[PDB]
């Protein structure tokens, strides 16, 4: 006889055994089967999903498989989600991938009714979940006041500058909050320096926004969550670029400034001394070969490792 | 592609986490006894790919631990919010540097080693729930996470 396991449900509350050790069952056919680890035979139930709509957006509140249980109580960070959205009558489904327990689907049409489907995936332990029961929601009519557009955060170390385009309130959320399981989230922390500003220039210090990574918010709905990592990374220094203009091909060599240079990824940024457009390509090794360039013309190359402008004129054609 | 660069990042980062863990109050008593120990495979020599996963798994579990009610400790919430974030930052970093490679992680998930590491952390979360998240249980867990971070540091030698 076989045993079916769907999360913490078994088939033939506060206190439970270890899901990673050797476990057995006895029912009285005189049941006594092969001893097994439940974590390999357990299936993933679809994730719980609740929809919330705005003018041009839909908020998909994903709850991971288990409320909360034990089978997935230590797998929650591993899980990823795939969302499918379409209007009620349509057949073409838009696909959005998310690690976030709340994924706001933007660029939507107001007073239109869209239907959703969320899949829970375990990208490392092979397993996956059957899509959730379809859920439909309708968008509201466009607000008399629109939400802020493009956001950019330029920081001078201990102080942050929030520059954007349009009374304005701002809220901050630590990086791990949007990414880790809800039930206790997402309670957005406030900003006193930017709570009712008159200008688009917003300045806040590291004392208030204490986490290394955080999201920013900008009666109107909420703006796009701008994620910004505050790291004192003044590493590594620029590499040493070498250019060899050959008959036709223009060979470029990137040299890292800390050798051995065995395992490294490189990037190139090339243009012309007359154009204002920059062309960029990345390779595996450092030997970049700029092929099919116009002859007798000056080309400016720049490189980075994962440099300063070095201009070289091509060859005529021997 | 190289593991030597990943070794420099995990060393820089475990220092960032160990400092944050130390700043919870000011006293870590390593003699704080509780029956659960880090699996023997961790102290023992292991594969090059297997180490990066072991680190990730440990940082994922250390994260999950600090999510629990730490109200009884009287620790600074600000520092625990800070710790979970620096922990999660690396968890996200490791998963992305093991994105292009996909075969060896499957072999690692079906390993007896990974199962033993997950069995261990299950026992750590179970311990805290049984002791109803009081100060003594956390005093024991803090001491264990310190010992664990040292194991993360020992494992970084397996990259060179």
CB contact (8 A) between residue A176 and residue B85? yes
* Phi and psi based region of residue A108 (left: phi greater than 0; alpha: psi -120 to 50; beta: remaining): beta
Q: What is the DSSP string of A126-165?
A: S-BBPPPPPEEEEPPP--SSPPP--EEEEE-SSEEEEEE-
Chain A contact for B88, CB < 8 A? yes
DSSP strands (E only) in A20-158:
42-43, 48-53, 58-63, 80-87, 94-98, 102-105, 113-121, 135-138, 151-155
Question: How far is residue B84's CA from residue B104's CA, in Å, rounded to a whole number?
Answer: 28
Contacts A77 to B, Cβ<8 Å:
60, 63-64, 91
Residue A128 and residue A201 in contact, taking contact as beta carbons nearer than 8 Å: no
Chain B interface, best mutation among A176, A258, A285, by max B CB count within 10 A: A176
Query: 10 Å Cβ neighbour count for A70?
Result: 18
Please tell me the CATH code under which domain A233-318 is placed.
2.60.40.10
Best CA proximity match to A217, nearest among A205, A209, A226, A208: A226
Q: Note the maximum CA span of chain B.
A: 46
**A264 touching chain B per CB within 8 A:** yes
Contacts of B1 in chain A (CB under 8 A): 263
B residues 103-142 closer than 8 Å to A (CB): 105-106, 109-110, 115, 118-119, 121-123, 125-126
**Residue A101, CA distances (Å) to A56, A57, A65, A130, B79 in order:** 20, 16, 12, 18, 24
Contacts of A169 (CB under 8 A, 6+ apart): A194, A195, A196, A217
Q: Which of A189, A198, A191 is nearest to A166 (CA)?
A: A198
B48 touches chain A (CB under 8 A): no
CATH 2.60.40.10 for domain A144-232, yes or no, is yes
Q: Which residues does A28 contact at the CB level (< 8 Å), separation at least 6?
A: none
Scanning B8-27 for CB atoms below 8 A from A yields none
- What whole-number distance in Å separates Cα of residue A18 and Cα of residue A70? 8
**Do the domains at A44-68+79-143 and A144-232 have one common CATH topology?**
yes
Q: Please state which CATH number belongs to domain A44-68+79-143.
A: 2.60.40.10
Residue B4: HSE in the Cβ half-sphere, 13 Å Cα cutoff: 10
User: What is the stated resolution of the deposited model, in angstroms?
Assistant: 2.9
Q: Using an 8 Å CB-CB cutoff, list chain B residues near A124.
A: 105-106, 109
Across the interface, whether the CB atoms of A179 and B92 are under 8 A apart is answered: yes
What is the set of domains in chain B, with CATH numbers?
A: 1-160 (1.20.1250.10)
**The tokens 């769907």 sit on which residue?**
A6
Spatial distance between the Cα atoms of A115 and A117, rounded to a whole number of angstroms: 7
The residue in chain A having the minimum alpha-carbon distance to the alpha carbon of residue B84 is A176
Residue with tokens 């998240």: B133
Residues B86/B146, Cβ–Cβ less than 8 Å: no
Q: State the pairing for strand pair A240-245/A310-313.
A: unpaired
Q: Say if A80 is an interface residue toward chain B (CB within 8 Å).
A: no
DSSP category for residue A37: -
Q: What is the DSSP letter of B70?
A: -
Inspect the interface and report whether the beta carbons of A211 and B88 lie closer than 8 Å: no
Task: Say if the Cβ atoms of B119 and A20 lie within 8 Å.
Answer: yes
Experimental technique for the deposited model: X-ray
Residues 273-312 of A with CB under 8 A from B: none
Residue that has been written with the tokens 């006041």 in this structure: A145
Q: Are B1 and A124 in contact (CB < 8 Å)?
A: no
Interface test with B, best of A41, A73, A77, A284 (most B CBs within 10 A): A77
List CB contacts (< 8 A) between A121 and chain B. Answer: none
Q: How far is A139 from chain B (nearest CA, A)?
A: 33
Phi, psi (rounded to 5 degrees) for B41? -65, -25
Question: In terms of Cα–Cα distance, which of A180, A243, A250 is closest to A215?
Answer: A180
- Residue A169 contacts B, CB cutoff 8 Å: no
């Amino acid at each position: 006889i076989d045993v079916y396991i769907i999360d913490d449900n078994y088939t033939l509350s506060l206190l439970d055994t270890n899901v990673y050790i050797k476990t057995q069952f006895r029912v009285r056919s005189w049941n006594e089967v092969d001893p097994f680890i439940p974590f390999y035979t357990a299936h993933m139930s679809p994730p719980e999903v609740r929809l919330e709509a705005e003018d041009k957006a839909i908020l998909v509140h994903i709850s991971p498989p288990g409320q909360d249980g034990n089978m997935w109580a230590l797998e929650k960070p591993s899980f990823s989600y795939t969302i499918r959205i379409w209007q009620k009558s349509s057949s073409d489904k838009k696909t959005i991938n998310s690690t976030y327990y709340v994924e706001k689907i933007p660029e939507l049409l107001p007073e239109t009714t869209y239907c959703l489907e969320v899949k829970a995936i375990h990208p490392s332990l092979k397993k996956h979940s059957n899509y959730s029961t379809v859920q439909c929601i309708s968008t509201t009519v466009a607000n008399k006041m629109p939400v802020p557009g493009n956001l950019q955060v330029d920081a001078q170390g201990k102080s942050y500058v929030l520059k954007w385009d349009y009374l304005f309130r701002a809220q901050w959320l630590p990086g791990y909050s949007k990414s880790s399981s809800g039930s206790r989230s997402d309670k957005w922390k406030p900003i006193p320096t930017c709570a009712n500003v008159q200008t688009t220039h917003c300045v806040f210090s590291q004392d208030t926004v204490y986490t290394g990574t955080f999201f920013l918010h900008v009666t109107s709905f909420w703006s796009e969550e701008k994620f910004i990592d505050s790291q004192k990374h003044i590493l590594p220094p620029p590499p040493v670029i070498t250019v060899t203009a050959m008959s036709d091909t223009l060979l470029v060599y990137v040299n890292c400034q800390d050798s051995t240079c065995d395992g490294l990824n490189y990037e190139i940024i090339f243009w012309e001394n007359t154009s204002n457009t920059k062309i960029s390509m990345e390779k595996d090794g450092p030997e970049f070969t700029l092929k099919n360039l116009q002859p007798l013309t000056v080309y400016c190359v720049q490189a980075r490792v994962l440099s300063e402008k070095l201009c070289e004129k091509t060859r005529p054609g021997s | 592609i190289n593991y030597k660069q990943l070794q420099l990042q995990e060393r820089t980062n475990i220092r960032k986490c160990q400092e944050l863990l130390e700043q919870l109050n000011g006293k870590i008593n390593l003699t704080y006894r509780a029956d659960f120990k880090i699996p023997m495979e961790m102290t023992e020599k292991m594969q090059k790919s297997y180490t990066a996963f072991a680190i990730q798994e440990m940082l994922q579990n250390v994260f999950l631990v600090f999510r629990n009610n730490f109200s009884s400790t009287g620790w600074n919430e600000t520092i625990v919010v800070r710790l979970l974030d620096e922990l999660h930052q690396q968890t996200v970093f490791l998963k992305t540097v093991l994105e292009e490679k996909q075969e060896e992680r499957l072999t690692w998930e079906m390993s007896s080693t990974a199962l033993h590491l997950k069995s261990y952390y299950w026992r750590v979360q179970r311990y805290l729930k049984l002791m109803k998240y009081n100060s003594y249980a956390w005093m024991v867990v803090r001491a264990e996470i310190f010992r664990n971070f040292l194991i993360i540091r020992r494992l970084t030698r397996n990259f060179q």
